[PDB]
Amino acid sequence: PLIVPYNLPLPGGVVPRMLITILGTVKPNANRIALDFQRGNDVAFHFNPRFNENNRRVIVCNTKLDNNWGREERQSVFPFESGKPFKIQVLVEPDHFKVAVNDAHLLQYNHRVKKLNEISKLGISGDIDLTSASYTMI
Numbered sequence: 001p002l003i004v005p006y007n008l009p010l011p012g013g014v015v016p017r018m019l020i021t022i023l024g025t026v027k028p029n030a031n032r033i034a035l036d037f038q039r040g041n042d043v044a045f046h047f048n049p050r051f052n053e054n055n056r057r058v059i060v061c062n063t064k065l066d067n068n069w070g071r072e073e074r075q076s077v078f079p080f081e082s083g084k085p086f087k088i089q090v091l092v093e094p095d096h097f098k099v100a101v102n103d104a105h106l107l108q109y110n111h112r113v114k115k116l117n118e119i120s121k122l123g124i125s126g127d128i129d130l131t132s133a134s135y136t137m138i
């Protein structure tokens, strides 16, 4: 396993056809997970499962620019479960990030940060045991 929070460098940023795969297990009584695709200090794509927001489970996605969070995009389909292993796949497409969990499509997030080749780090944090983090061009 890998120490959380974990930094995965994305050399030369992201580009359409690049697939980022995260494997791990949700801890018991998890509160949150976060995948933060960063352009320097900016967060181009915050992918943020929340297990207990007012007794509901929800996937929140957002962008941070100049330390200002933007308008959230929320998805109530929630494929994660405390205690269970997961796979998150983030496929970069020309106009959005496409996310699949356990091989089932979950959501898409339109690119707000336009300089894809400057989104050069993925931060992985939260209540997980992290097994692997990698990318491939498809």
Ligand SMILES: O=C(O)[C@H]1O[C@H](O[C@@H]2[C@H](O)[C@@H](O)[C@@H](O[C@@H]3[C@H](O)[C@@H](O)[C@H](O)O[C@@H]3C(=O)O)O[C@@H]2C(=O)O)[C@H](O)[C@@H](O)[C@H]1O
Binding pocket: 046, 048, 060, 061, 062, 069, 070, 072
């Ligand atoms: O429980 C609450 O309602 C909570 O609300 C605020 O915090 C929320 C949120 O829960 C925090 O996690 C944080 O979210 C930031 C960011 O602001 C948001 O736009 C982005 O999508 O996610 C971020 C993240 O995950 O870190 O801040 C939120 C906020 O409203 O400010 C209160 O700050 C907190 O005290 C609590 O009441």
